[PDB]
Design a protein around this ligand. Sequence first.
Ligand SMILES: Cc1onc(-c2ccccc2)c1C(=O)N[C@H](C=O)[C@@H]1N[C@@H](C(=O)O)C(C)(C)S1
Length: 245
Amino acid sequence: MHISSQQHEKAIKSYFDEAQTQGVIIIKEGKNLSTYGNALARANKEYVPASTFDMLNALIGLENHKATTNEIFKWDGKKRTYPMWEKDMTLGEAMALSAVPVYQELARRTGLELMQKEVKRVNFGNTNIGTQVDNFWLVGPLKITPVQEVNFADDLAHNRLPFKLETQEEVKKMLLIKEVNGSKIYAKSGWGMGVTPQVGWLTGWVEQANGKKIPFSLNLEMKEGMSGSIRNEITYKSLENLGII
Ligand SMILES: Cc1onc(-c2ccccc2)c1C(=O)N[C@H](C=O)[C@@H]1N[C@@H](C(=O)O)C(C)(C)S1
């Protein structure tokens, strides 16, 4: 409104301070990138993308006819880390649930060789997937910075990735997670491996009523007993503080 930028900066740093974590949220208006939060130097450090990769995994699988958007991925009946994953689902349902096994099956369909060259073509992060086609986004060697992630989301939001328009639209329909007063929030979460603390992500964009698109990438540390929805909460408060929703 008439709120000073010092106050915006302080308000958003306090959302990270209150959660007792260290993180950054990067916003992009048109060409301009702004870095908020309580740990601004995270912006150009490299982290595994974790499930945020699901977005590119989907783009690639669909572009290369490894799946369709109505196709059902059967649960094989093995006990899963979460009961919510013990069901048959579409890619899109799997995006909302972040169903690692489905994205792993998709990655195996695509294959190491095809995955490696698609990730080069797209030049995502450090572009390196190593030798294990089914976990390189979760344990490395693939890594990416928060700046690169918000630029990725900015590409996909404006259909600039090197995939057909219809492939991009298909994956964007999968990413709708919230509606707030005429604004829509498209995004995918990520949560890295290992003992606490782990990396957390929420990367996407808001599509405003007038058609304007404002990409964001939140990146922070997931501390002992933090709920996943803290990523969402910090993100929503930040976007609201800045009047983007
Ligand atoms: C955490 C997490 O910690 N370790 C792995 C992993 C799994 C298999 C092999 C190697 C590592 C993992 C994971 O699965 N992360 C996923 C992607 O970010 C899923 N997104 C989460 C979410 O979005 O909230 C889920 C907590 C829903 S899981």
